[PDB]
Design a protein around this ligand. Structure first.
Ligand SMILES: [Ca+2]
Ligand SMILES: [Ca+2]
Ligand SMILES: [Ca+2]
Ligand SMILES: [Ca+2]
Ligand SMILES: [Ca+2]
Ligand SMILES: [Ca+2]
Ligand SMILES: [Ca+2]
Ligand SMILES: [Ca+2]
Lengths: 5, 302, 292, 305, 5, 5
């Protein structure tokens, strides 16, 4: 879903 | 006469290199006696004593014990760990030589390949279970991660974490990490297990030995898939992203002059960007196009 | 050098024709021929508004429901592809044997397509329903929620069955391991053809509910009759003993069930019953099985 | 090739000899108990003791349709083994046995039993380990471990290799929880050489006759290079008024010789003591404060569980 | 143990 | 790892 980069 | 169908050859090649790992902690509420807190497995990678295991096996350990199938027991040094791959590297100081896992850099994991899982489930002792490669490139059970799991139906239980998944020649295919056990209608899942492919495992290990941690570039955002691109769903408040002025609902189409085609390949892309770099990201708000400069930071630790 | 033991060949032959079926996850499906026809379970496409199927090559099609059958839990979908389709390999000369290596292909828990390996554990199984014409193959290749409607193939890729249900809860709440059921491909292909031309599975029936019982000879005893049923109108009441159906001794309930189903509706046939140890031949006009 | 990969040859060789075991009791309740293995043409059948331990009347059903009432020849709680006998006419299938085959970790195996009374089921896995103490540390079953799916009702059934040769008698499935989860693919079978050995004792006697010394002991080894060492079985506990206690064997004695044979392995010594005919008077050399003592022990029969 | 047909 | 015999 939400990807942290 | 004829001989029974057997994967004993793979066992004899690979199993001696799979060790039992014990995470012991001090009983601080008592008198600091060492007690087992969790256990798992590990894989001896080369003759210098480097061992790959899972991070959750060794987290916050006051003593890491590594037990080989041939009877030798070692205290292990934590070389480093990476929370986003759930990988960790241990060092043991063995002077008489070590069994090392067979590794074939040329072998490509194929779906349907026969694989053997080698671990220490429930502390029963080293256990061999058989299945196939069920899928490649899986994200597992949480939807955000760089673990790129192999999926397998070889039986994986508690205690297999950090052990070897191996094909019929004894060649290392992956590091068994996680088993499925949640459900929508309360069924219990069967034969759904995940292992980090050996290619990524060795890559994380070499970074852990070199630097003591996995250094990644990081922008400070939270994105999502599909005008195809990536949508900013949130931005960390001091993210390089934030200092560079990227905001929510912004449609990212390019990152360092590579198309933002998919969050997974862009997530890989930014991670290898050395921290402190300044890269362009091409953005869109209200159909108007902008190009902003973001100063890459290092991914925050755990 | 030497090569890893592998069933990748079967995956390459069979996996492209196994599709994930959605409603916009429901289960899996099997592309059967070049015309866009797809088999799945009935329970996977039941409750669904408008059905779409997703191929491993990336294409997405809306599917039209051609027909379904509750007694077998099968359904046939139809897609209209212009670029040619991959289809499951089907070997009519192949007899499924216990101990054959098989691969289950489906989309469990919407993780994507998953391949699990086991063997054929048994044949001719009723499943979990103690009354069943589903004729299951049993397999220990891991089946999970989402595998329904998917394909079970052998080491050559040839279709062996349509995965349908696993056994997940038994005595106490014990969780069984490696007990799944797939519908044999010979049965699934016939139901597909019957659904494609007639829109339903036309089956003839008599309308009785029975049990299996100087000497005494094996027979079925009525417990219930359909009110306007082919049996009640012929005048058989509850507790009659059924000896013959179209001159076939009614000894095995599953076998007379099979026989009656194959009798085309509208057929006039003899039925030898018995009341108070008196043998009576009766005339019955078979009607069509009422759907559910 | 034109033939798919299959273990149907092993099924055809071995599956006819694996029976479904039932109890006939109270109107008439025919309750499924487990599985069993026809071991020879005389009609002697091996199952687990825990399969039949409650049975009023043991019914044995063959795959070909024949049904028999079975007689309990005997059982043994230390190995959870039981021998039944049927009286059949016109021949019986028998399970293939290769007394010379050594089971190896990784060998493909098939589990054959009757799980949940679904009817005879074949499942496939591999030999996962050997010498496994199991789930209960009786330490006298020497379990093979397998991931061939074992369910309630597989007990007493057969584990065979790809040639249909008998590897073991499926006995137990792992279901203990560490954190509330369910284990998968961990099951245990009694090795066939032990099954055969106990069967012959159960056929000839009412049960297994075991010599007994009344010691709780464990193997040792030194501590790093090995120097100075002593090998043997260290006495951890002495059952009071047992043969060892009456003979003067004390805790932390190091048994080094039993009945004129060096005590090297606990299991070898354990098995040897079982084979000593009760009432025999045997020598037992121990090391006590680095001096050898020879103690005269009168072997008893193993106490009844 | 009733069978419907 | 105590053997009773
Ligand atoms: Ca685990
Ligand atoms: Ca499995
Ligand atoms: Ca399902
Ligand atoms: Ca399940
Ligand atoms: Ca179980
Ligand atoms: Ca299995
Ligand atoms: Ca059982
Ligand atoms: Ca599990």
């Amino acid at each position: 879903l939400v990807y942290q980069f | 006469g004829p001989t029974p169908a057997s994967y004993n050859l793979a066992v004899r090649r690979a199993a001696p290199a799979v060790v039992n790992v014990y995470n012991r902690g001090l009983n601080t509420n008592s008198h600091n006696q060492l007690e087992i807190r969790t256990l798992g497995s590990g894989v001896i990678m080369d003759q210098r004593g480097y061992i790959i295991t899972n991070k959750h096996v060794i987290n916050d350990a006051d003593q890491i014990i590594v037990a080989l199938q041939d009877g030798r027991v070692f205290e292990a040094l934590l070389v480093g760990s990476d929370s986003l791959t759930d990988l960790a590297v241990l060092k043991i100081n063995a002077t008489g030589g070590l069994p090392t896992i067979p590794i074939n850099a040329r072998r490509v994991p194929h779906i349907g390949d026969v694989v053997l899982a080698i671990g220490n489930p429930y502390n029963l002792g080293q256990t061999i279970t058989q299945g196939i490669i069920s899928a490649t490139g899986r994200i597992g059970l949480n939807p955000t991660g760089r673990q790129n799991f192999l999926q397998t139906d070889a039986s994986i239980n508690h205690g297999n974490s950090g052990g070897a998944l191996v094909n019929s020649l004894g060649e290392l295919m992956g590091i068994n990490t996680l088993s499925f056990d949640k459900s929508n209608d309360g069924e219990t899942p069967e034969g759904i297990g995940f292992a980090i492919p050996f290619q990524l495992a060795t890559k994380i290990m070499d970074k852990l030995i070199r630097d003591g941690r996995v250094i990644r570039g990081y922008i400070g955002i939270g994105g999502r898939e599909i005008l195809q691109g990536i949508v900013v769903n949130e931005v960390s408040p001091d993210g390089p992203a934030a200092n560079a002025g990227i905001q929510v609902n912004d449609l990212i189409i390019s990152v360092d002059n590579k198309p933002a085609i998919s969050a997974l390949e862009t997530m890989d892309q930014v991670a290898e960007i050395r921290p402190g770099s300044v890269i362009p990201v091409v953005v869109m708000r209200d159909d108007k196009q902008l190009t902003l400069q973001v100063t890459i930071q290092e991914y925050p630790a755990t």
